[PDB]
């Protein structure tokens, strides 16, 4: 067979230990899920420094804790705007997930609080910026470099899925690089607790699984499809399915055809054909052996999963970092006021925050 006795025993033991870890992690998650933390700091504990990001998602600001000098990334949502855009449940659920999970590649929520006008999530500052920027700048990642990142996503999805959390928002724009060169996953507005199926059309065109496009009930296998898109884009510099208009992208996704650059290794192409599998009865991550079909694939043969988890692998790339407040890996945005009204807004809607 493919493994001798020693290798098979070692692999089996490793897989059993993962089960044991995940069972403990689920116990810890559910305690925090059932009794969320609230109101652990206030706004005047922090100096506002610079806007790190802004969009439909609100704003994210670099802030500095006045007494420790620690920098943080503070997500600010306008309560009235969240209600207008019909995002109450997503906003509450994002914060509830973030205060309950614990994993080395999931961003840490250090404080949260609210005031008359806004909701605030104070997260670790991840200074290396988006993977997106580095990928477009370098062009493409070599396969070992791509694999280093991919391994962290595999472990993070293995963790999230064991909690019955589907992620649904994977793309390089939503992965940050920390000071050690490791990945941080930050955005949980599309994440949902799903033991079985769910039906919402959400995501980004290039990363949508075919069953989402086709308006099916779907499951956590959409995240393994998206991993395939991510690995392809990291290794090629462009995603597998693209076109001028989303409808043309969707036609390609559902077609069952995917084409590869000539520099892709055969191992990589085999992994990607099994992740980018339209047929759900054949897609890696959705079969009887679950995540192990991915972790045991030839393309990951050199991956020491425990060493990645322990963050003991030397990263391929360390972003430039000139001090704890450095924002050079982020873009510049127009700086807008943080207005706090004398009157409380939408109090009932956000009692749980």
């Amino acid at each position: 067979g493919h493994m001798g006795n020693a290798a098979a025993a070692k692999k089996g033991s490793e897989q059993e230990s993962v089960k044991e870890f995940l069972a403990k992690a689920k116990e810890e998650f559910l305690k925090k899920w059932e009794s969320p933390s609230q109101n652990t700091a206030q706004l005047d504990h922090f100096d506002r420094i610079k806007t790190l990001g802004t969009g439909s998602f609100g704003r994210v600001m670099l802030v500095k804790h006045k007494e420790t000098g620690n920098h943080y990334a503070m997500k600010i949502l306008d309560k009235q705007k969240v209600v207008k855009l019909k995002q109450i449940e997503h906003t509450l659920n994002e914060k509830r997930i973030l205060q309950a999970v614990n994993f080395p590649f999931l961003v840490k929520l250090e404080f949260s609080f609210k005031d008359n006008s806004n909701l605030y999530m104070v997260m670790e500052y991840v200074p290396g910026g988006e993977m997106f920027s580095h990928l477009r700048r370098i062009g493409r990642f070599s396969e070992p470099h791509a694999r280093f990142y991919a391994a962290q996503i595999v472990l993070t999805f293995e963790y999230l899925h064991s909690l019955d959390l589907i992620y649904r928002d994977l793309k390089p724009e939503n992965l940050l690089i920390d000071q050690q060169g490791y990945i941080q996953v930050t955005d949980f507005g599309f994440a949902k607790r799903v033991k079985g199926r769910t039906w919402t059309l959400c995501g980004t065109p290039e990363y949508l699984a075919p069953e989402i496009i086709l308006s099916k009930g779907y499951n956590k296998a959409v995240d393994w499809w998206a991993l395939g898109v991510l690995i392809y884009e990291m290794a090629a510099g462009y995603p597998p399915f693209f076109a001028d208009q989303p409808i043309q992208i969707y036609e390609k996704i559902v077609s069952g055809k995917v084409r590869f650059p000539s520099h892709f290794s055969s191992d990589l192409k085999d992994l990607l054909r099994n992740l980018l599998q339209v047929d759900l009865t054949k897609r890696f991550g959705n079969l009887k052996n679950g995540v192990n079909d991915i972790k045991n694939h030839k393309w990951f043969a050199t991956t020491d999963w425990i060493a990645i988890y322990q963050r003991k692998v030397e990263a391929p790339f360390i972003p430039k970092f000139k001090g704890p407040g450095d924002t050079s890996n982020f873009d510049d945005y127009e700086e807008e006021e943080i207005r706090v009204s004398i009157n409380e807004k939408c109090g009932k809607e956000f009692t749980e925050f």
Binding site: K171, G203, T204, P205, L208, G237, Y238, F242, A243, D244
Partner: peptide, 18 residues
């Protein structure tokens, strides 16, 4: 080339959710 096709798509920048 596929890279040229990628540039032609106009979707080389940050992509919004649907």
């Amino acid at each position: 080339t596929x890279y040229a096709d990628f540039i032609a798509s106009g979707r080389t920048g940050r992509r919004n959710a649907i």
